[PDB]
Amino acid sequence: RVQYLRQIHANHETLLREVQTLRDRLCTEDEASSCATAQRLLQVYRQLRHPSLILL
Amino acid sequence: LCIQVLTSSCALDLDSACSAITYTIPVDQLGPGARREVTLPLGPGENGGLDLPVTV
Amino acid sequence: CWFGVFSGHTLGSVISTDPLKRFFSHTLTQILTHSPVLKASDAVQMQREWSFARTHPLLTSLYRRLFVMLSAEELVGHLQEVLETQEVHWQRVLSFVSALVVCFPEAQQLLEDWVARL
Amino acid sequence: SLSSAIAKHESNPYRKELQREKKKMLQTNLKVSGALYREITLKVAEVQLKSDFAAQKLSNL
C-alpha cells in the first residue's frame, strides 16, 4: 500500500533536513565540535534502528 | 600457510597500533586426508574492547 | 494551465489526499468568499446570465474537477454550512449550484433537503 | 530515492460521465512492484551497514 510508504518518506525527510542542518553547522563551526552533535546524531540513529528494514 | 587477522576495515585520521596481525606456519608433507590445527588469540589484550567484524 | 495543474491526476497520485482534500476545501471556500461585489439581494435576472452554458467553460471545468476529487454529500453539507455562516459572491455560488445539480448523480433531493431545512 | 522511485511506480449526463471517468483515473493505485522495493531495500541494507559501523566507532568514544 501507499499511505504507509509516504508516511515513512516524510518521517525520513524530516530527520534528513535535521541532519543536513547539523552538517552545515559543523561545516561553519556553528555548534563547535563539542559533544551535543554526537549525542544528537546517536539519537537520530537510535530513532531509525528500532524497526529498521521491514523486508518484503 | 599465512593467516592474516584484520581487526577492522576502515582507515582513520590516526593510524592504529595494529591494523592487522599476520602469522605464518610451515606446512610439512601434510599427506592426504590429514589435518593440522592452529589456535589464534583475537581477543582483548587492551581495554577489553573488540570491534567486530574481524576478518581472518 | 493553472486549472490544468489544479486537475489532480499528476498531483493526487503522489500526495495522500487527506490534506490535499483540505487544500481543495479551503480552495472552494476562498473562491466563494473573495470579492463579494454584486451582494445585491436583487440579483435575480443575473441567474439567467449565470446559466451554466453562459458561465465560462474554465469555471465549469474547475468546478467539475473539484467535484471529481471530492465527494457529493460532504460538498453539499459544507456549502450549507458556508452559505449559512458568511457572506457570498453570488455569481460564482449561483452558477456553482447550477453546475452542482446536473454534475453530481441525483443530488437534487439532498439539495432540496437543506433548502427545506433553511 | 526509495520513496521517490516508488511514487513514480505508484503513478504508473455528460458531466456525470466525466466525474466517474476522472474518479476512475484517481481510483487510488494501492500497489507497488515488490521486486523494485526489494532492490532498493538491498541498496539500503548496504548503507545501513556502513552507518552502523560508523556508529559503533563513535559511540565507543
Side-chain angles (χ1 to χ4, degrees), chain C residues 11-22:
Chain C
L11 188 69
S13 306
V14 50
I15 309 173
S16 170
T17 320
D18 184 316
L20 180 57
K21 278 217 183 171
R22 301 192 190 139

Side-chain angles (χ1 to χ4, degrees), chain B residues 1 26-37:
Chain B
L1 184 37
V27 165
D28 292 327
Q29 304 166 28
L30 186 60
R35 158 270 288 275
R36 299 202 148 93
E37 73 148 358

Side-chain angles (χ1 to χ4, degrees), chain C residues 57-92:
Chain C
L58 279 188
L59 294 165
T60 302
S61 161
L62 192 72
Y63 293 137
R64 281 178 188 179
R65 290 161 184 173
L66 294 170
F67 307 143
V68 165
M69 39 198 84
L70 268 165
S71 82
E73 284 279 33
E74 192 279 326
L75 280 172
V76 307
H78 188 82
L79 286 156
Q80 181 176 346
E81 302 263 1
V82 166
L83 297 152
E84 279 161 1
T85 46
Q86 60 94 32
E87 52 81 7
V88 171
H89 190 60
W90 292 118
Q91 310 192 298
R92 289 160 211 170

Side-chain angles (χ1 to χ4, degrees), chain C residues 7-66:
Chain C
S7 180
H9 311 282
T10 303
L11 188 69
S13 306
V14 50
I15 309 173
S16 170
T17 320
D18 184 316
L20 180 57
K21 278 217 183 171
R22 301 192 190 139
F23 164 70
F24 290 125
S25 185
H26 164 82
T27 294
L28 182 82
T29 319
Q30 183 269 12
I31 287 167
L32 258 64
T33 295
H34 183 276
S35 189
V37 296
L38 303 158
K39 265 206 199 164
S41 298
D42 289 342
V44 174
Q45 268 176 349
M46 280 60 72
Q47 292 181 300
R48 173 174 204 185
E49 286 161 29
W50 306 328
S51 175
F52 178 94
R54 291 209 224 185
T55 303
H56 290 282
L58 279 188
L59 294 165
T60 302
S61 161
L62 192 72
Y63 293 137
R64 281 178 188 179
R65 290 161 184 173
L66 294 170

Side-chain angles (χ1 to χ4, degrees), chain D:
Chain D
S1 49
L2 183 151
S3 320
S4 47
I6 283 312
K8 293 189 289 183
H9 199 76
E10 311 192 324
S11 300
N12 297 314
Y14 309 107
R15 299 172 216 179
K16 292 167 198 196
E17 284 166 316
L18 300 201
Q19 280 176 358
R20 291 91 177 267
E21 278 180 342
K22 286 201 199 156
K23 279 166 163 159
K24 179 266 293 184
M25 287 183 76
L26 295 206
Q27 285 181 318
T28 56
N29 279 34
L30 280 305
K31 307 208 187 173
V32 181
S33 65
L36 177 53
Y37 189 71
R38 179 206 27 75
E39 272 182 18
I40 307 299
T41 66
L42 312 194
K43 258 183 296 304
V44 168
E46 191 43 53
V47 68
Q48 191 163 352
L49 255 67
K50 289 287 158 287
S51 280
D52 292 306
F53 200 106
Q56 88 172 325
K57 275 281 178 174
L58 179 51
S59 291
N60 192 358
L61 189 82

